[PDB]
């Protein structure tokens, strides 16, 4: 029975290795495009789907900031520009943190808004959320303070108390 | 008797495995497009439909934010843009939470509105609703506080008291 | 005698199973389009119609929000846009609640209006109505409070006292 | 003698079954279009018409909100739009109530008007009328309070005292 087709080499390799490690007989075939298909024996189909689902496979597609065409036709000013500037910063932070030995994945979600409550009343919202996944063989718990400091000084008007850093082993 | 045609491999596999686990004789065929059809013996048809319905199969299509063409022809400002920004955030949160080992599905619904009650009266509504489904073999109850903190710091002007995190085993 | 033609596989299967369970001799044929026709012996016609009617078969078509073309030709602002935003939320809630084990169908009707009574008098109407149908073999009565909390935090300015959750066994 | 031609299968089946149950010799023929004709012996014609009339057969066509073309050529604002919004709600309520086991038909007529009596005098009219027909074999009298609550919370600014729920056995 077919599981999934048109998988990248990495997605197919991670799913194949996960299934093989759980005693599931899985086979892989490459199509003409270099995309991969995974298949299992019918008796292992239910188990295979359970294991894949439990490990977030296949990875979901989420909204892409670039696919903004449905929302607006042109950008001459501020809200959309600020979203892209924020996205660029989140990616810059993820790129930097990813160089730390032991990090295998990282997500950064930043909040920076300049609001006008009313005449003579300006608020500033700041905060950052950081999730880093570490290799099974590396404890990054001691590096939490260093990661917080790196995030703090990469972004405008952030304090330590408004940064959440969560580290989870794969 | 035919159950459903034009199923994805995942939807067909989950329905086939559910029926087989409940002693229902189900068979599957692939069409030309790689879409799947499920069929059962006529004596098991009523049972099969009962089991499928009880487990939310087949999954319903709900309104897609992108299918906004029926509602408006062009977007130059705020309500539609804010809905897309909110949707992007909900998806970013779902993507992040989905990496936690044990999570097999997640839904996030965010509320963030800036309202003007009258002259010199601005209200701000905040809150988030989070539903996460965990694998049968993983207790994520101890991770509720961590999930709440991740959601809190991903989104503008959210407090813990205004976040609902519900975890349900598949 | 013919009952109905051009039925979906699910509608035809549910009606066939209901009639067979009530000792009604019903037969089914598939047309060229994959649509189904149900027929009964003439001596069982009256009974068959009584049973189908008593169980809401065939399901009625109700107004589709997308079929708004008869009402207005273009939408540049608020009433129609807000109806679509509300419909999207109702569908998002139904999608979320449908994942709860035991739920076989769900309907959500939301009320959220911002009205101006007169100069310096703004009212806000809030409330939600939720109907969930559960499988015969699952008691969801203990989950009423959880369902109310999920609905509360998905929608702007809702309190628990203004949410009705009704659960009915199929 | 011919009774009626161009009947739907359901209308023809209900009329045929009603006549047969009252010892009237009725026959049915299907035309090329799949429409049905009912005929009776001349000696039973008067009785047959009396029975059909007494049971509201054939069902009358009433004004369709969509057939508004005779009344106005275009809709850019409020009265016609509000009528369609109200009709959509009535249909949504009927769809929801129809899922209750025992319901075989339902009609909802809603009243929601926002009127300006004069300068600094706004009235709001609210109320709902609900008629539900139940199967002969189901008592829905105990469900009146539940039906009222479902109707109350589906619609803006409704109180229980302004909802009429009438249940009649077929």
UniProtKB/Swiss-Prot annotation, chains A, B, C, D:
It is found in: Cell outer membrane. Coiled coil: none annotated. One of its GO terms (biological process) is protein secretion. Keywords: Cell outer membrane, Lipoprotein, Membrane, Palmitate, Protein transport, Signal, Transmembrane, Transmembrane helix, Transport, Virulence. It is a lipid-anchor. GO terms for cellular component: cell outer membrane. Its main location: membrane. It comes from the Bacteria. Required for invasion of epithelial cells. Could be involved in protein secretion. Belongs to the YscJ lipoprotein family. This is Lipoprotein PrgK. The lineage of its organism: Bacteria, Pseudomonadati, Pseudomonadota, Gammaproteobacteria, Enterobacterales. The gene is prgK.
